[PDB]
Amino acid sequence: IANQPVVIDNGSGVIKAGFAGDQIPKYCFPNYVGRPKHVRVMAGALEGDIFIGPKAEEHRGLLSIRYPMEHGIVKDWNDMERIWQYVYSKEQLQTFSEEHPVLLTEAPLNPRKNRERAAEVFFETFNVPALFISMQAVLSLYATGRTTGVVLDSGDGVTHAVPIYEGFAMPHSIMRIDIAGRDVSRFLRLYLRKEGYDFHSSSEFEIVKAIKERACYLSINPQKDETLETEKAQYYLPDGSTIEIGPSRFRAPELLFRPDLIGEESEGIHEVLVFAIQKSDMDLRRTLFSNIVLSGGSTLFKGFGDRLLSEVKKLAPKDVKIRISAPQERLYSTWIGGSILASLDTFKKMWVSKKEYEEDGARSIHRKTF
Amino acid sequence: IANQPVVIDNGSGVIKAGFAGDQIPKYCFPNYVGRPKHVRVMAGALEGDIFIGPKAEEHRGLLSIRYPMEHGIVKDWNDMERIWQYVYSKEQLQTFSEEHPVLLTEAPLNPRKNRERAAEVFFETFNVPALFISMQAVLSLYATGRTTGVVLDSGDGVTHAVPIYEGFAMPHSIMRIDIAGRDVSRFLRLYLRKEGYDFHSSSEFEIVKAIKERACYLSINPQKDETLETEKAQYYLPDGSTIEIGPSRFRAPELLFRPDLIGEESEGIHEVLVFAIQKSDMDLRRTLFSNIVLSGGSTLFKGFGDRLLSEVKKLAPKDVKIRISAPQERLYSTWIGGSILASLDTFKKMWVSKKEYEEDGARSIHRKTF
Amino acid sequence: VLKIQVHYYEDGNVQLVSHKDVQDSVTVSNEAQTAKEFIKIIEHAENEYQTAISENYQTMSDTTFKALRRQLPVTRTKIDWNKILSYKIGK
């Protein structure tokens, strides 16, 4: 049973889905389970009472949204089972889990219990013939076409830098933080309350994400922007009321570089990228500096790459050629590589079959990933 | 000016202090400088804003702890000057630096620039009458009461096997690594993130040291423990929340014997011990095997000595009597030896006087140590 | 010319072989000075030689001997044999 395998690129913010060998993930939707706040009196209402995907995006105001995933670590397992069931259902893929092998993705240095519980779900509740879990940084390099280089990523949950050299993902130089897009959106929400406009509800939280996506730029010199007075640019909400954002738009994405603002002594994106290169070996450093790849949604801020270049110039050794490359489709870079990895004939050797899982158990899954 | 001399036993993890001719060091405290993270709003707060010793241990959560000394090599010189000033101050010793001669300690085969800058601090900033730097292994043998034998040690910074035979410290046969308790604590911290329970803060770093001290054991056969499934024992943190430790507790101290796990080339503790014995002369090897002294905090793991004995049996030539002896107080072994060395009447001849330093300089300090 | 030689033959051989050729120009003045000038040239040369012979080799041989074959791989991880026997590279 070697059918066309499914690639479910898991993410904290957005989840991507589709089949192997495609150019783009056809099925992209946000990873949450919306459930109705209000009581349903009238007949002919929205049936089911568990909303995932475009129905939940359409009817935000009704639904008390709650994310199952946090920092690449699922808290609510029943919600992720419902999401994975929705992915395979007729509303998105129109296929059975019994036929196709599954490619899954996770962030590096995550809980092993969550990886086992993920495998348990795919093998037992769904009846998968073969499963394979992989990294995000390895796939992104497969998508670009390169072998060597560092992969800085910044999703909704995790920011992690993994250096790779000629198809060898270095495990001991993996840097990681739990500061990312969701924490920037949470920090923006807290700043908007200091400005004036509060957004306490869970449906109302996605307005703050929409403000963060549209109207946020990363200034090069933060001390110069702090001394100067802002212009206070406007933004229209889904209701229609105006919001003067002010200095909260430029101080919001500073969290990723200065994690001291939220109240959490971490390294930051630029330090993580330097630390990943420094932990790796002297001979590989100059090739790793030249090949720096960006991915994830929280790298899409205005002047993000320009600031990340300036921070590398400050920290890294002098007279070294720096190059932070970035693809056109950064949001789908990890999925494209998985689709490429799935299409290759060697994918048959790497996966964990259902028979092998039933015989061995969790130990075989831990061996095959690394 | 021949007053009762002071013995400041240096160390990356812990720093010992007190007077000469004593049974135990009265003044023991961890070698770091805690500084306040949070904003001191209320009047009548903790004054000073630079905390060392028991105040820093009492108020961990406020302070961003950072160590000045890594691998027996001080990085931040201003921090060590503040620590030495705190040692001499009324809160610990209740003495002046001008009255008493000084006995300093350092790890063997260090950079000489740090040894010079250490002497500069003692002679210029403090007004020391006479200084003397010495080895840790030489002192530990004076504490036990033997002359012949190897001294394996394992502090927080350095692990080094120094062979000595009847008051002849062979400078050439000294083996050394930059792998020790701090790297084991860092490796255990990395494993706890793989388990699930993440600790990133600097105050929260000392909880990992406390877990490493309490809940760890070194297995004899690591392959047998890898095949078997662990019991997952519990431990209560300073807060109250329970943590199932799992397989991290036994795989963490394997770093000392297998240095490849962190991602750095080294020999290992057991190899270093064999290697220190081999580099010495052929006639003296059997006496060095019979007298193997242990020291430092990172030798206190459960089944550490039993694993060392098995590793020696594997590597060393057959039909040789192996004996890895150790004192009761392994933490204060080096300081007792210094207190004994300082109490002796010979001590006056060995030291570097302030007048001799002012005349010659660093060259006289390099001559008197060796 | 200044030649060193050391040879160790236990459990297999190791040899140190060396030399330094030096060309110098000195000016004659006195018997006390010419006696203490040449010796000074030898003293500084043979120390610099021993210094380099001891201090370069203890560190630089370790790194050049390592540049030929490294103590651990470019990943700094012991190579996985299971990985080698079921992985494909290239394009």
Coordinates of C-alpha atoms in Angstrom, one line a residue, chain A residues 15-16 26 31 40 49 77 80 121 141 148 165 187 215 238 258:
Chain A
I15 CA -1.7 24.5 9.7
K16 CA -0.9 23.5 6.1
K26 CA -3.9 23.9 -1.4
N31 CA -5.0 25.9 13.8
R40 CA -28.9 28.8 20.2
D49 CA -21.0 23.2 17.7
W77 CA -5.1 16.7 22.6
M80 CA -5.9 18.4 17.7
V121 CA -3.3 9.2 17.5
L141 CA 16.4 23.7 2.8
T148 CA 24.4 23.7 3.6
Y165 CA 26.0 21.2 6.5
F187 CA 2.6 42.0 23.5
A215 CA 0.5 47.7 10.4
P238 CA -14.1 44.9 11.2
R258 CA 14.6 42.3 22.9

